[PDB]
Amino acid sequence: VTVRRFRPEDLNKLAKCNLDPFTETYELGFYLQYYAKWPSLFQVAEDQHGNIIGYIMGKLESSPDVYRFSPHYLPWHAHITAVTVAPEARRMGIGRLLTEQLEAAADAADAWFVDLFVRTTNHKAIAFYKSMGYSVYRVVKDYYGDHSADPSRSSEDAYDMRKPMKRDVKREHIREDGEKHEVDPSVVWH
């Protein structure tokens, strides 16, 4: 397995990974926007036969300055927008390898933390991130527009998970009891 930057020519090769039920298929322009703005953070894992068996998409940012007085304001941080590894290639360290490389970029950029949204029913991913030092910071109610298991539910909550980076010397951006803190999707901004 070799890790390298995503290139647009890879767009037709993500299909196998995106069959996974916890992996979203975004619109073309979305992938291409991450390629344009954060190309170093859009990485793919390819096997010896040329197939893409995983990828990760990340970004660096803070909340818009107009929200600087909100208790929900996010300082400069790295965000994992998507990560996925083909089911035949799991538990080989690919997910961790992709994540560690993004963390290294976040560390070099003085990010306060790395965060991500995860479906509350995605126990595999939750166990993965917890093993790497991520914890739940808050629950975003109704973040996902559908449920992963129950079609009668109109939505599914997200855990917003965070791993502290070394800039957070006082650990003021992580919580021990994050599952008890709920927010509405309206405090997630773009």
Binding site: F22, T23, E24, Y26, T81, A82, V83, L116, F117, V118, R119, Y143, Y144, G145, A158
Partner: peptide, 4 residues
């Protein structure tokens, strides 16, 4: 995974 970000919401669609």
């Amino acid at each position: 995974m970000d919401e669609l």
